[PDB]
Amino acid sequence: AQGTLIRVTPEQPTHAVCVLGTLTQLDICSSSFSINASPGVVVDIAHSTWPLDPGVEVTLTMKVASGSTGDQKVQISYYGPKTPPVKALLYLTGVEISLCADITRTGKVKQRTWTWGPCGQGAILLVNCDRDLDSEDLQDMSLMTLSTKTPKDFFTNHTLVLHVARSEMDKVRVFQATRKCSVVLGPKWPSHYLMVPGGKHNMDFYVEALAFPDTDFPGLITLTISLLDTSNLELPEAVVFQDSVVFRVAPWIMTPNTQPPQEVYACSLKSVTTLAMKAKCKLTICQDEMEIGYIQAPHKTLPVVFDSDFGYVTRGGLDSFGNLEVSPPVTVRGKEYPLGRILFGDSCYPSNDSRQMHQALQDFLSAQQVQAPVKLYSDWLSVGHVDEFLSFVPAPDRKGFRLLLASPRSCYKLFQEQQNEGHGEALLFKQQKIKNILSNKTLREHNSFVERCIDWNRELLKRELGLAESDIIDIPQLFKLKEFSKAEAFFPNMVNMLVLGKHLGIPKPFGPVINGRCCLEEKVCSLLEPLGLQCTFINDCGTNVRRKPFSFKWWNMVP
């Protein structure tokens, strides 16, 4: 490991503390020699040797915690070419000082750096999410334990201080478990003296994070323990040993439509509550301005809501959470994305009239980093949400899902196939005949332009999400360019659906009724049902969907 420097001399004897586990270095030449020491002290040297050469390395390491000061000694025999051997003494005191936490992410407490992956190491911290002590309120916090084994009279000359760097103090809080609980490290103070008794003992600390990773907070918080020597009332305290643990603040994670729905929330019609039932998912009644996510820690995962037993956050129209989505887990050219990939849209390039999502929002999502955000193009739509052109649904064969992209083309073909069949007289919804829609050149170019915008996204999603055409399903859907040539749905946007597990709540396109059945509605089912989806059309919608968090622990990822 690593350690301190002890200098011995024939002059007088030396005393010293040695912490179990640390590598203590010894300086012998600065006065042939010999090393003889107590049974409990393992002294190994490398070119045991006799040559009094400074290039020689001598290391001590206590075996067990001394029962009292100076239990173990080490004598250095100085001798050589016909001279009566002089002797150098050294009294050691072994203490056990270990600051422990849940570094194995196993939910159990048992150099110092945080590492990702299933083979990595590092305790995890949740952020305190409360809007407006004992076990009654500390189950959400992470446990840190200090264990010591020292000679009964040990803390008369040494004291332990717990600290955090000043740059991280406003991001963490530490409570001491007195076997009530009081703050010992926090935004107010970076260090704190511990009241620790000699002998065998161990106190409990409870830690919580006060901020999520962000532009200016990589996300790591380090807690260090220090062993101070204060045996000389005159001199100031001397650090004799330090050790620490490194916690990482749990990111805020979004949940994709492919995840089982756990609960739906509605504001202040009963088509949703009917669909919720078939879903096998709770329903409760009181806005699409927030997003239900989740933070996860070995010892607990807690649902957290994001807006502008629930936790909340408030960071910050493309600037809406309605313009925030997440891909299903996907692998891209070897790299793995277990928790999906955050999708949010904006414009192809910055203009005088370009809308975008507030940079604070963007910066924050990337800072969670575990769902590496992907920018899409939605600025062409009047409202601008990515939900207006895409959607994800569960699948039982391919990769376990299908990307649904709106398709004006799929609609022209359908309406056309209808005409050929003699139904050009069919009415949509001013009602318009399926014959006029087709003959309408202006509507055609408008949709031809939207096709361009969506295809651009098709390509983007195929690259960033490792998709293949076999993963995509185009849904018939038309558009119209209204204000500022921005796009709106010609008829209810079916790709803007409530994916409740495998039961879809698609908006009702009051389209051409052919044979007692709306041809669009009919076309949509012929595309999804062979996938297991049970389609149902509502007559549109303030509704959120708390979904089951991923089984894959985010910290096993490798960003």
Binding residues for Ca(2+): 128, 130, 132, 137, 140, 287, 289, 291, 307-309, 321, 324-325
- Dihedral (CA of 35, 41, 45, 48) sign: positive
The partner residues of 297 in beta bridges, in order of sequence, read 300
Q: How far is the CB of 209 from a copy of itself (least distance, A)?
A: 19
**526 contacts: CB under 8 Å, gap ≥ 6:** none
Give the C-alpha separation, 112 to 225, whole Å.
Answer: 12
Given the complex with a copy of itself, which of 67 and 317 has the nearer CB atom?
Answer: 317
The two structure tokens encoding residue 547:
């979904």
Q: How far is the CB of 455 from a copy of itself (least distance, A)?
A: 4
Q: How far is the CB of 215 from a copy of itself (least distance, A)?
A: 6
Active-site residue (options: 29, 267, 348, 541): 541
Given the complex with a copy of itself, which of 438 and 513 has the nearer CB atom?
Answer: 438
Residue 25 to residues 3, 244, 490: CA-CA distances in angstroms?
Answer: 7, 21, 79
Give the C-alpha separation, 279 to 499, whole Å.
Answer: 10
Other beta carbons within 10 Å of 51: 9
Give the C-alpha separation, 57 to 59, whole Å.
Answer: 7
Q: How far is the CB of 163 from a copy of itself (least distance, A)?
A: 4
Given the complex with a copy of itself, which of 121 and 362 has the nearer CB atom?
Answer: 362
Burial class (CB in 10 A: 0-12, 13-18, 19+), 385: buried
**Does residue 288 carry a catalytic annotation?**
yes
The two structure tokens encoding residue 67:
């029962």
DSSP structural state of residue 327: P
Given the complex with a copy of itself, which of 223 and 304 has the nearer CB atom?
Answer: 223
Given the complex with a copy of itself, which of 88 and 264 has the nearer CB atom?
Answer: 88
Angle in degrees, 0-180, between the axes of helices 441-464 and 408-420, rounded to the nearest 10: 130
Give the C-alpha separation, 164 to 221, whole Å.
Answer: 8
Given the complex with a copy of itself, which of 54 and 516 has the nearer CB atom?
Answer: 54
Q: Which residues bind a copy of itself (CB under 8 A)?
A: 2-5, 7, 25, 30, 54-55, 161, 163-167, 169, 190-191, 215-216, 224, 226, 232, 234-236, 238-239, 242, 348-351, 356, 359, 362-363, 377, 380, 409, 413, 442, 445-446, 449, 451-453, 455-456, 458-459, 463, 469-470, 481, 485
- Dihedral (CA of 392, 393, 394, 400) sign: negative
Q: How far is the CB of 220 from a copy of itself (least distance, A)?
A: 13
Burial class (CB in 10 A: 0-12, 13-18, 19+), 307: middle
Give the C-alpha separation, 347 to 327, whole Å.
Answer: 20
Query: How big is the CA angle at 327 (ends 115 and 122), to the nearest 5 degrees?
Result: 15
Active-site residue (options: 158, 299, 385, 446): 385
Q: How far is the CB of 256 from a copy of itself (least distance, A)?
A: 25
Given the complex with a copy of itself, which of 98 and 224 has the nearer CB atom?
Answer: 224
Active-site residue (options: 387, 411, 503, 518): 387
Active-site residue (options: 170, 229, 288, 319): 288
**Does residue 535 carry a catalytic annotation?**
no
Q: How far is the CB of 349 from a copy of itself (least distance, A)?
A: 4
Phi-psi region of 333 (alpha: psi -120 to 50; beta: other; left: phi over 0): left
Task: Indicate the residue type of 141.
Answer: M
| Residues tagged active-site | 288, 385, 387, 541
